[PDB]
Design an enzyme around this catalytic site. Sequence first.
Site, PDB file in Angstrom:
ATOM      1  N   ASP B  49       0.813  -1.213   0.000  1.00 55.73           N
ATOM      2  CA  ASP B  49       0.000   0.000   0.000  1.00 55.73           C
ATOM      3  C   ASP B  49       0.846   1.262   0.000  1.00 55.73           C
ATOM      4  O   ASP B  49       0.986   1.912   1.039  1.00 55.73           O
ATOM      5  CB  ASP B  49      -0.937   0.001   1.203  1.00 55.73           C
ATOM      6  CG  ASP B  49      -1.910  -1.148   1.170  1.00 55.73           C
ATOM      7  OD1 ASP B  49      -2.016  -1.808   0.114  1.00 55.73           O
ATOM      8  OD2 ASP B  49      -2.566  -1.389   2.197  1.00 55.73           O
ATOM      9  N   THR B  82      -2.856   3.503  -4.578  1.00 53.38           N
ATOM     10  CA  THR B  82      -1.748   4.037  -3.802  1.00 53.38           C
ATOM     11  C   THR B  82      -0.452   3.326  -4.153  1.00 53.38           C
ATOM     12  O   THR B  82       0.605   3.959  -4.255  1.00 53.38           O
ATOM     13  CB  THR B  82      -2.067   3.910  -2.319  1.00 53.38           C
ATOM     14  OG1 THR B  82      -3.196   4.734  -2.009  1.00 53.38           O
ATOM     15  CG2 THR B  82      -0.904   4.336  -1.491  1.00 53.38           C
ATOM     16  N   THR B  83      -0.516   2.012  -4.353  1.00 48.22           N
ATOM     17  CA  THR B  83       0.620   1.307  -4.932  1.00 48.22           C
ATOM     18  C   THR B  83       0.628   1.443  -6.446  1.00 48.22           C
ATOM     19  O   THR B  83       1.643   1.167  -7.094  1.00 48.22           O
ATOM     20  CB  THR B  83       0.585  -0.168  -4.532  1.00 48.22           C
ATOM     21  OG1 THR B  83       1.793  -0.810  -4.959  1.00 48.22           O
ATOM     22  CG2 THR B  83      -0.604  -0.863  -5.175  1.00 48.22           C
ATOM     23  N   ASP B 380      -9.052  -0.687   3.086  1.00 43.38           N
ATOM     24  CA  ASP B 380      -9.293  -0.533   1.655  1.00 43.38           C
ATOM     25  C   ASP B 380     -10.718  -0.925   1.292  1.00 43.38           C
ATOM     26  O   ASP B 380     -11.414  -0.171   0.603  1.00 43.38           O
ATOM     27  CB  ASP B 380      -8.288  -1.356   0.858  1.00 43.38           C
ATOM     28  CG  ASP B 380      -6.881  -0.818   0.978  1.00 43.38           C
ATOM     29  OD1 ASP B 380      -6.723   0.313   1.483  1.00 43.38           O
ATOM     30  OD2 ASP B 380      -5.936  -1.504   0.538  1.00 43.38           O
TER      31      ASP B 380
END
Lengths: 509, 517, 508, 512
Positions: B49, B82-83, B380
């Site tokens: 993440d 986000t990644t 998430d």
Amino acid sequence: ADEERAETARLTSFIGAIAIGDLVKSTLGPKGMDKILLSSGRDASLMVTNDGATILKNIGVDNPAAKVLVDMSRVQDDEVGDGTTSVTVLAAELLREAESLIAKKIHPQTIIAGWREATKAAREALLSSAVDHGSDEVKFRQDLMNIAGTTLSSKLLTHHKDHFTKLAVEAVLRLKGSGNLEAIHIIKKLGGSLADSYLDEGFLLDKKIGVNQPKRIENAKILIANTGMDTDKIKIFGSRVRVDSTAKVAEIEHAEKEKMKEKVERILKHGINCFINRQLIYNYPEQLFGAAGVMAIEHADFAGVERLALVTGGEIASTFDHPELVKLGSCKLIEEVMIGEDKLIHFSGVALGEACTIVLRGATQQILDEAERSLHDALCVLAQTVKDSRTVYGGGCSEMLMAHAVTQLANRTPGKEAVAMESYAKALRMLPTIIADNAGYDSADLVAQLRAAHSEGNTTAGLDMREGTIGDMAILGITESFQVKRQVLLSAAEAAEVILRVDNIIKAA
Amino acid sequence: KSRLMGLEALKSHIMAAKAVANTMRTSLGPNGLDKMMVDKDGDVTVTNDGATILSMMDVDHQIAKLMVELSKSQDDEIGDGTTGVVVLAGALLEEAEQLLDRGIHPIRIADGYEQAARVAIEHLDKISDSVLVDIKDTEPLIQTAKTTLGSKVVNSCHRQMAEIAVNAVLTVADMERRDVDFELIKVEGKVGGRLEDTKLIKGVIVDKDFSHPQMPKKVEDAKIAILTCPFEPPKPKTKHKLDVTSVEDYKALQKYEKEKFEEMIQQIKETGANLAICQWGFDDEANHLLLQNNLPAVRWVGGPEIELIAIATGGRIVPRFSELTAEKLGFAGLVQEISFGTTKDKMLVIEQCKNSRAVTIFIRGGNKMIIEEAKRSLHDALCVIRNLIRDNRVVYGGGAAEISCALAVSQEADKCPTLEQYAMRAFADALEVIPMALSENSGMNPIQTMTEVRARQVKEMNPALGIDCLHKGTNDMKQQHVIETLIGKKQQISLATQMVRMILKIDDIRKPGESEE
Amino acid sequence: DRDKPAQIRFSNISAAKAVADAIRTSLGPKGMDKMIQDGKGDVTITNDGATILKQMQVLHPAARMLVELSKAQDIEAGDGTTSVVIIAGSLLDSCTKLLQKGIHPTIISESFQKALEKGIEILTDMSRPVELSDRETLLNSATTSLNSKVVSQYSSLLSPMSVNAVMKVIDPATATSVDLRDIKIVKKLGGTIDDCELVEGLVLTQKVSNSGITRVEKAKIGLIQFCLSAPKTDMDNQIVVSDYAQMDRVLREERAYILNLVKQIKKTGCNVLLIQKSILRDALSDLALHFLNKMKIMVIKDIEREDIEFICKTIGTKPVAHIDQFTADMLGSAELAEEVNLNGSGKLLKITGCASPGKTVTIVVRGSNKLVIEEAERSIHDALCVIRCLVKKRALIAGGGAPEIELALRLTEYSRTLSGMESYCVRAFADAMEVIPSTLAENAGLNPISTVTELRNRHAQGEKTAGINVRKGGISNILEELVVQPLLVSVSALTLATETVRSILKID
Amino acid sequence: TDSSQGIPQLVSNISACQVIAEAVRTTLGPRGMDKLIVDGRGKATISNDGATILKLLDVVHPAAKTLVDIAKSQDAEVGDGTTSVTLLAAEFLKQVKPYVEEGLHPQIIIRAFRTATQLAVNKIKEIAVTVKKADKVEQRKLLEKCAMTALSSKLISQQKAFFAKMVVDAVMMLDDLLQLKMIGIKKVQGGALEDSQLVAGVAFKKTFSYAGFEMQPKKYHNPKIALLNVELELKAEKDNAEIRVHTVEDYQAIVDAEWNILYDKLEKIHHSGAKVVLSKLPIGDVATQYFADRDMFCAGRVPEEDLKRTMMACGGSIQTSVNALSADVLGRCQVFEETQIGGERYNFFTGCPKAKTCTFILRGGAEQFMEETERSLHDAIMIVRRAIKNDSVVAGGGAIEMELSKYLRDYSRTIPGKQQLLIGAYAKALEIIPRQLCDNAGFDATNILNKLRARHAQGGTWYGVDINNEDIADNFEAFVWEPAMVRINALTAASEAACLIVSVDETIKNPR
């Protein structure tokens, strides 16, 4: 924080964790050779290990991937007992594979993929080599005696195992289908011989207050207590430690005596003939228990007062918070008796029938704690062996069996999965190399013959590191219980598969 | 003093960025691979993440510092990408760089990326469905909350966490706006159970003050007394010893506690619960004498907690003993005392229907890191629906949408021409880099599996089926059940296409000679 | 690797011969002194195995194994400190190659530890039984070893006193190990050699009894590990006077401890009292101990603990650290206890006769000056040691390293009889015995190279006759000039080589 | 006690002065590379201009420090004109260096600088165009189109034309200053772009939720506002204590006496005059419990930039205590209204007794467009304020810059001597400024610049290269609009900022 990408971490993963799988496989087998223990940073004093868990606990390693194995080592060693040096090497065995596979362009995703299914293929072949022995008590007797001391083989002190495992199987023979290792009171206590290590039927205390408290009692009520005496617990019988005025500090002692003395009463008034305290007992309440017919044992064993609470039916006093109110330990027999050189306080008539005290007697504590280290891992397998009474044929036998099984499955799979799965059962074939090469005998002879033997399939002829050559697994005692294997087959490929998903390593160190 | 020129700064901004971007692209999907974190202390932790692991990563280089800051706003609304932003923010990066090294201005194609970002957004917004409902979302949320747990913590579906993660949202989703916020429900990590052991709570919960277990554990009313004032005599984190003018005065001291217990129990009794939530942990020798007066006091719990559990009910905390008031006491729909873990004591479970400003999913785990990444899972699965609450909306793909998103931007490049054709060249391909870079970390050719859906996008449009995050043989972004809010993908684009432009901000790369130290 | 461990164990194999070689040309008195600089940087002149290894040393694991070797020889014997270090490097040559010769080091060890068994089997077979109940045959091979070795002068006086202690302490026919625990080595300052005595009760170092009985019958042996002074804060007594109005009030309870425990000594009754030192015990009230003496108990005030230890276990004076523990029963009962200024100068409490566990005798080393007292030590002790070896393994054997060379000859052929992969092992093993007398036939001078050649053949020929005379250092008889190994002096060093070696060969 | 004499130090001065201009080369039209600059303090340092990083950079050079201070002498006046002065004077210094080797060194150095800088301002005010309230515009329609100049010049969207009037509102309300320190702007995440707002006083973005925060009034038509520079929290006055017990009666007390003071602290302003209490620093539970006991408004952690402009707006004072304070030190409005906009708990402050603050409220419903316009607001502000201040409005984007150097290339013919070299250097300096915004327009500078020269042999009214349109044409008719006042300002700087150190080739420094 520095990002380790694939090969950076992964080579660093191999070099440590496979070598971590090496000096432990150097210990793999009883003829896994002795490793002088050279400690890292402290304790230059050197034991010499036939079991790699020591090295893992003794020697710290900077490789984080190798920092994982010691824990997985301790997973086995604590949870599963034996399988400790073994869970580390088979991962390294699977890591040696991924040495190629990564540089051989195989992504560690795939490297897990086969090993995902392949793990059961060996499990299932080892479920096939899983056959219930111990289905009878005499079986169970010798099925314990099989894998009880087999746990003690690589573990440095396999010799007193003669007396030890007999003790170890008897206590678990006494368990009779209900595994209780707290009903087995484990006392490692110096004195006498190591073959003088003992199993009491009852509870026991290595703590002896002395003979100034009643030594033997029948129909004795044991108070199980954190109750303090000079410690000044609740419910004032007379001034405890405090200053309420000029002379109030003086009113403490004499009325603290009365407080100690009525902390005889509250404790005594249970009707006890024994007061076993996990905390201090002041000498006046002590001796006033000795004058009450009560045996007051000071700072008696934490686990003992706990097992005395478990095995004898005792409740802790809630630290005198039950001055009169706490359920007693009740053991019809009090014996202050010398096992070894030391008088130990034996408790029989305890609540539990499986309640036993195994007294491990050091002629030296280096073997004694080693006896205790060899004690429980057996007992770990034993409780397992109790719940699942069964074996699997060790010494490479089921290894090569699983090897020839999973590989021929890796031969019927062979998609991306066999790339792992051929890499998988080769480890099942490579560990038979380890013990035999520890035995100092050609594996390429034996293994590749053990191959043929298990390419014919085999439950019997397997590599006997005792003989150093291929030999029978009939349940000869080198045939392992299905207990550890399934756990190692579970636990081992993990750390491999675990590092397989994380090649990415972010290091702020 | 160091002076970088143009690309030099950029090239210096290229170094770690792509390297950081490289670590993202092997994390993409179950095909991808988690990012282990060894701390400055050496603490070895598997993490993910990016903003999380980029917060764990120490950002020295400048562009990475926004990667923590940019991806922050990314995780909040979305929970994924986000990644994936640093992927494109790294992918779109050397897109411009080589163009800048083709002589292309930062004045030129940099607009074109955002100019292609909108049209890719505009294209994306068609892909799959901008539409969901409180019912539909559940199945996307199922295939979200199965895999969100079923990626991070386990790979299996854990339902009691899965839909309780989404229903926790759905519980406060309809509390506000038809929109929850990410604090408006909470994820409370403690391990008494396994992973699957959890507590869905419509208010906050704590482990009750227990000054001795044998004293009766009770819970009553619907309501709780949240107490700065004395519940019983308060103790202000300070010892109180035994001083009595006579041996009889100690036993005379004994009544003072118990009478002030029930008096201030009676003073709490009429107001709320019979139970405390007291900002003061009181003497536990005396507390269990009040636990012997029963009506358990919750004490020795944080001063922020009385604040917390109060406001979570919309109520207050009674400041003074003369200030005791039911509104100055907290609330609940049900206060219940329920065992934390199976074996341990009964934590006070405050389930608050008299208001819920946070509906707390309480979670247990076999271990932290799993309950952590089960928490980090929930967040998430909580974040993805925080998109859904606003617009109930999703899409299927990073290897379906983007290759399709790119496909519009693709020939749109030569539809651009002059400035941004090289942008929408370098934009479209950078989109298809993610299925490439995911096919990279897949067992497949990043070119061929990108070629796969390439042919498919030369065939199917707005595909529900695209390459494998879940690493299957078939690639169906609907039936891989990779499910990402078309808000998120859109927002991701907006966020991912963002940073690369931002390194162009003003003409000043000028440093005194320290741009990092 | 096993090779990095090998290179380690080679370094082990190497360093184990390294410093042990200073022992090898040190074998026997014909073996030579080695001036040894020390960690303090001081020359140390030593011919002996126990001293050299333990004096200046290093960190290598082999050096760790060195000090174990003579020491394990010492706890077994105290005799053959050097020889036990000579057998290591011998085998260390038998060991090293078998690795390089393609034999696994466990097979190498399970050879040598088994090759030991089969090997040292014939040692006792070569050996001869001697009477361990008869004082002479004890004293014989005691002194015959002492005739073979250095200590004679006061030995031939105190070697029978050794056996006089031994004859007393030998209950059985094999005489067990004659644990020297049944014997007590003690030293009086004043007095001469001939004053060296054997008392069934225990002689005690000094004594302090001020008003008390200097000789007491049927003596209850008191143990004061408590105090005669009320517990200390700033003083010996419990008296600290900051006020008189309080001092009258302090007067009341400080009167007991000096009275009670003192009287408790004779309340339980005591003819004797063991008391550790006023430094070993907080304070000892003399004003209390004087009345305690004057009660005609025998007080040894400030008595050493290790004699108390030997008093506790050997003559049965049971531990009293406390009043809870102070009874007439935990007191030893001394058939006689006497403060003795006799036997030269200076006081010694002598328990004379006692009810004792084991067979307890105190052999008090004595001499006209301190070294002559110290001359009396190995005068009693060395015989006790060579005895305790002769008894632990009953049979005696002709010594001098002939049984080394003797059975070195044989076990080879019997190794060769074994065949298997360990025949070359056990033969290398069997060979190692030859080098010990080699160095001996070296150190004694001239030709070791010849010595063992004929001998091992003479050991296929005459055996026990032809051997290594330590004086001659060549083919000779250890029977003609008497060199006797009480088997345990040999039987000790047998396994100790193989064991650490088996370990260090198994050591990675 | 150190000096370097002659040309060697002189020429050495320029680069230290020039390199910083090589940063700002075009930082007004921003496009280029921007490196986040982290100084030795761990401080990430950036700018919307050249000046702020110039504020961050220090030199031992007097020279490199001068034009810094000079660009700063130009900076804080308009808030702009920094990069301009930063480039031009350095450019002079940059261009005289080769002349310096030929030599300009005689004090024929300093003359043609200021001598030709008047020729510019002689051309400035003759070509200058004045704007008014009835003229072409309301002067709000100017400040509209000067916002539509300044706001729109950088992108964004027709809100730039919407804001163009909207930004002018608090402008007109507060117009005295060239800048916003009375005005300020409230960023609003939430709502949408099409609606942006303006308040006739400060309006707090967010005040902060507590226990009883909902139970405290979000609305006052009569706020009497304690304006606190200081926190009131559970940490502010301790609740921790103890007391001796043979009777437990005092457990209630020893905490309660402290409890009374947390109350009394906040209450004593509450009791005296205060309804609203605005703290810029935390409010903790037990304090806000008494603030919730008060239910006369509590705030903490609120912006002081609003809170001190609240002092400006209200007439109360920033308060360093909750105590010792009167009722006049209290802020006052006729509106305290907190209606949460997005996540911002949004306090309406209006109806102030003075309302020295009137703040435009930019509401985007999204982050990006705002801070682009919020950056363009400062643009508008620095312009639309100054567009009122100097109603004479020149045009930028090489309008006169190409038209001046046009004549100032034409002025070279009459010079010849040593300073004709200066004339050319002085000329094209005007044109080295757009020589970037050409690139920001995507244009080659020189051809475009030469066109503009030809375009000033054809035209020459406002004609110039405008990154505003990315074209070449009349600037003032392209809506390139800034007052002509800043020109003289910059040109008083331009030629003169260079002539300082070139008057010194011998520069002494000392340790003391």
